[PDB]
């Protein structure tokens with residue numbers, strides 16, 4: 552991701568875009584959607600025991616937010 | 618479903634590097650179409666795999682799916698290609714607190730008390746959601762547009778319905794006694810770390826700092842905190858109520874928020 556720094560990414564253009572975004576937050580579900588459950592096997596192209604064996608860490612009683 | 622979205626590198630334009638972090642670099646970026654500004658953190662899979670910390674990445678993402686708070690850095694989503702995992706993060710326009718400490722050495726009372734209030738608020742929310750953070754320290758803290766603190770990284774954190782774990786976590790200077798002893802601990806490890814953080818922010822070094830590992834362990838276990846002549850009484854009081862050997866004696870988050878020194882000095886701002 553090594554590119555020449557474009558004008559939007561510095562100085563007043565960046566500040567003003569940040570200001571706009573700060574005071575006009577978008578609908579983040581619509582923008583980014585659901586956070587998909589992690590498949591460690593898929594991501595690392597390996598089967599390891601820790602990938603499948605969970606503790607209570609895996610048991611959520613509160614809702615996904617987005 | 619309808620909100621299962623396709624995210625790839627081609628959805629983003631890169632602005633500039635923001636710095637090296639664990640397992641890769643962070644970049645300022647924006648979504649090509651909406652122009653929504655983010656930080657894109659690029660994680661190298663091989664580095665994570667080698668170190669065997671795949672389960673920590675899973676913890677981050679699962680925590681991020683269930684928690685949001687104005688003082689927690691938000692993970693909007695993630696994706697991956699063959700070699701890299703990309704975290705699409707909330708952009709923190711005022712950057713690393715630990716860079717703003719290189720500037721001054723220590724923070725003033727207003728700035729510190731503000732961060733302490735924000736963190737006690739954030740951790741109340743975490744603890745209510747059965748998440749122990751376990752890595753509260755300056756290097757984990759980013760600054761929002763108006764300086765509001767953002768906890769950056771949940772990699773050492775865990776969701777624990779029972780609020781009882783045993784993994785040794787975090788950095789040397791921030792270890793609570795019960796972790797050094799290898800005992801089972803609860804969420805009150807976070808209370809200890811707030812104490813340590815408050816000290817370091819005001820003083821510019823952590824309270825049990827020593828040239829050697831064993832000596833640090835010894836100072837932690839003895840709770841050998843000695844406050845420099847520079848520190849105001851209110852802060853010495855707050856820190857003394859948090860840095861207790863016994864977890865059950867540590868000042869609860871609700872009472873940190875009510876602490877006269879926090880109330881006096883905090884100048885917290887919230888985004889919309």
Ligand SMILES: COc1ccc(NC(=O)Nc2ccc3c(c2)C(=O)N([C@@H](C)CO)C[C@H](C)[C@H](CN(C)Cc2ccc4c(c2)OCO4)O3)cc1
Pocket residue numbers: 635636637638639640643656658660665670671673674675677690704706707708709710712713756757758759769770771772773
């Ligand atoms: C393998 O398991 C995991 C588990 C968790 C993660 N999550 C993760 O890496 N999150 C994250 C997010 C922001 C970070 C860091 C880490 C990080 O890598 N930090 C280091 C230095 C200590 O662990 C914490 C810093 C606050 C780091 C600062 N970076 C380098 C510059 C930065 C500048 C501005 C930013 C920004 C990041 O994100 C939003 O806006 O910003 C990754 C892999």
